Protein backbone atom coordinates (compact mmCIF):
# COMPACT_ATOMS: atom_id res chain seq x y z
CA UNK A 1 0.00 0.00 0.00
CA UNK A 2 1.12 3.56 -0.65
CA UNK A 3 -1.63 5.00 1.52
CA UNK A 4 -3.11 4.73 5.00
CA UNK A 5 -6.25 2.72 5.67
CA UNK A 6 -8.40 4.98 7.87
CA UNK A 7 -11.86 4.57 6.40
CA UNK A 8 -14.93 6.77 6.82
CA UNK A 9 -17.77 5.40 8.99
CA UNK A 10 -20.60 5.19 6.53
CA UNK A 11 -22.18 3.08 3.83
CA UNK A 12 -23.34 3.33 0.22
CA UNK A 13 -26.99 2.53 0.87
CA UNK A 14 -28.23 5.88 -0.39
CA UNK A 15 -27.09 8.50 -2.95
CA UNK A 16 -25.14 11.50 -1.68
CA UNK A 17 -24.15 15.09 -2.48
CA UNK A 18 -20.37 15.52 -2.34
CA UNK A 19 -19.84 18.82 -0.54
CA UNK A 20 -16.37 20.40 -0.72
CA UNK A 21 -15.46 22.52 2.30
CA UNK A 22 -12.85 24.52 0.38
CA UNK A 23 -15.36 26.74 -1.38
CA UNK A 24 -18.56 25.08 -0.25
CA UNK A 25 -19.34 23.56 -3.66
CA UNK A 26 -21.22 20.39 -4.51
CA UNK A 27 -19.36 18.14 -6.96
CA UNK A 28 -21.21 18.28 -10.32
CA UNK A 29 -21.08 16.47 -13.66
CA UNK A 30 -23.09 17.62 -16.70
CA UNK A 31 -24.54 15.23 -19.32
CA UNK A 32 -21.70 16.14 -21.69
CA UNK A 33 -19.11 15.09 -19.12
CA UNK A 34 -18.11 18.54 -17.85
CA UNK A 35 -17.04 18.30 -14.18
CA UNK A 36 -17.02 21.20 -11.72
CA UNK A 37 -18.59 22.46 -8.49
CA UNK A 38 -21.70 24.53 -7.82
CA UNK A 39 -23.22 26.02 -4.67
CA UNK A 40 -26.74 25.54 -6.05
CA UNK A 41 -28.38 22.79 -4.01
CA UNK A 42 -31.26 22.70 -6.49
CA UNK A 43 -28.93 21.56 -9.28
CA UNK A 44 -29.95 18.26 -10.92
CA UNK A 45 -26.43 17.03 -11.66
CA UNK A 46 -24.87 16.88 -8.19
CA UNK A 47 -26.37 13.60 -6.97
CA UNK A 48 -23.92 10.70 -6.76
CA UNK A 49 -24.22 7.01 -5.95
CA UNK A 50 -21.06 5.37 -4.60
CA UNK A 51 -20.38 1.65 -4.57
CA UNK A 52 -17.45 -0.43 -3.36
CA UNK A 53 -15.51 -2.81 -5.58
CA UNK A 54 -13.13 -3.76 -2.79
CA UNK A 55 -12.99 -2.40 0.74
CA UNK A 56 -12.06 1.26 0.47
CA UNK A 57 -12.27 1.29 -3.35
CA UNK A 58 -15.27 3.04 -4.87
CA UNK A 59 -16.99 4.00 -8.10
CA UNK A 60 -18.66 7.44 -7.97
CA UNK A 61 -21.61 7.58 -10.35
CA UNK A 62 -23.95 10.39 -11.37
CA UNK A 63 -27.52 9.23 -10.67
CA UNK A 64 -28.83 11.74 -13.19
CA UNK A 65 -26.55 11.01 -16.15
CA UNK A 66 -25.37 7.53 -15.20
CA UNK A 67 -21.73 8.57 -15.89
CA UNK A 68 -18.84 7.42 -13.69
CA UNK A 69 -16.51 10.06 -12.32
CA UNK A 70 -12.97 9.33 -13.54
CA UNK A 71 -9.52 10.98 -13.75
CA UNK A 72 -7.57 10.82 -17.00
CA UNK A 73 -3.87 10.38 -17.76
CA UNK A 74 -3.29 14.14 -17.41
CA UNK A 75 -5.10 14.35 -14.08
CA UNK A 76 -8.34 15.79 -15.48
CA UNK A 77 -11.66 14.62 -14.13
CA UNK A 78 -14.16 13.46 -16.71
CA UNK A 79 -17.30 11.36 -17.06
CA UNK A 80 -16.98 7.80 -18.34
CA UNK A 81 -19.97 5.96 -19.80
CA UNK A 82 -18.61 2.60 -18.72
CA UNK A 83 -16.48 1.71 -15.67
CA UNK A 84 -12.73 1.43 -16.27
CA UNK A 85 -9.50 1.58 -14.25
CA UNK A 86 -9.65 5.41 -14.23
CA UNK A 87 -13.02 5.32 -12.42
CA UNK A 88 -11.75 3.69 -9.20
CA UNK A 89 -10.96 5.86 -6.20
CA UNK A 90 -9.49 5.12 -2.79
CA UNK A 91 -12.07 6.61 -0.37
CA UNK A 92 -10.43 7.46 2.97
CA UNK A 93 -11.09 9.38 6.17
CA UNK A 94 -9.03 12.57 6.55
CA UNK A 95 -8.43 14.89 9.53
CA UNK A 96 -10.63 12.38 11.41
CA UNK A 97 -13.72 13.86 9.76
CA UNK A 98 -13.77 14.32 6.00
CA UNK A 99 -13.64 11.91 3.05
CA UNK A 100 -10.93 12.16 0.37
CA UNK A 101 -10.82 10.31 -2.95
CA UNK A 102 -7.48 9.28 -4.47
CA UNK A 103 -7.21 8.04 -8.06
CA UNK A 104 -6.40 4.33 -7.73
CA UNK A 105 -4.65 4.43 -11.10
CA UNK A 106 -2.40 7.28 -10.01
CA UNK A 107 -2.29 6.44 -6.31
CA UNK A 108 1.51 6.52 -6.22
CA UNK A 109 1.40 10.18 -7.27
CA UNK A 110 -1.23 11.20 -4.68
CA UNK A 111 -3.72 12.57 -7.24
CA UNK A 112 -6.98 13.48 -5.54
CA UNK A 113 -10.46 14.56 -6.55
CA UNK A 114 -10.59 18.24 -5.58
CA UNK A 115 -12.43 21.55 -6.01
CA UNK A 116 -10.87 25.02 -5.91
CA UNK A 117 -12.60 27.93 -4.15
CA UNK A 118 -13.79 29.22 -7.53
CA UNK A 119 -15.63 25.98 -8.19
CA UNK A 120 -13.23 24.63 -10.82
CA UNK A 121 -11.83 21.06 -10.55
CA UNK A 122 -8.21 20.63 -9.65
CA UNK A 123 -5.87 18.71 -11.95
CA UNK A 124 -4.39 15.62 -10.32
CA UNK A 125 -0.76 16.83 -9.99
CA UNK A 126 -1.97 20.09 -8.41
CA UNK A 127 -3.61 18.26 -5.49
CA UNK A 128 -1.89 16.92 -2.36
CA UNK A 129 -2.31 16.04 1.28
CA UNK A 130 -3.02 19.07 3.38
CA UNK A 131 -5.32 20.99 1.00
CA UNK A 132 -8.91 21.94 1.76
CA UNK A 133 -9.69 21.35 -1.96
CA UNK A 134 -9.55 17.55 -1.42
CA UNK A 135 -11.81 17.47 1.65
CA UNK A 136 -15.37 16.29 1.08
CA UNK A 137 -18.41 15.76 3.24
CA UNK A 138 -21.01 13.35 1.81
CA UNK A 139 -24.44 14.85 2.48
CA UNK A 140 -27.82 13.17 2.11
CA UNK A 141 -29.84 14.06 -0.99
Curated annotation (Swiss-Prot):
InterPro entries: Fibroblast_GF_fam (IPR002209), IL1/FGF (IPR008996). Heparin binds at residue 22. Residues 116-132 are annotated as: Heparin-binding. Changing residue 117 to E: Reduced integrin-binding. Defective in integrin-, heparin- and FGFR1-binding, and defective in inducing FGF1 signaling, cell proliferation and cell migration. A motif (Nuclear localization signal) lies at residues 13-16. Changing residue 103 to A: Decrease in LRRC59-binding. Predominantly expressed in kidney and brain. Detected at much lower levels in heart and skeletal muscle. Belongs to the heparin-binding growth factors family. This is Fibroblast growth factor 1. It comes from Homo sapiens (Human).
Amino acid sequence: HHHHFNLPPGNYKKPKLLYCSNGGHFLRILPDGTVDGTRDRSDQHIQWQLSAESVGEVYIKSTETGQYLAMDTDGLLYGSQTPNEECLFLERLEENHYNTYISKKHAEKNWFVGLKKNGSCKRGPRTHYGQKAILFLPLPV
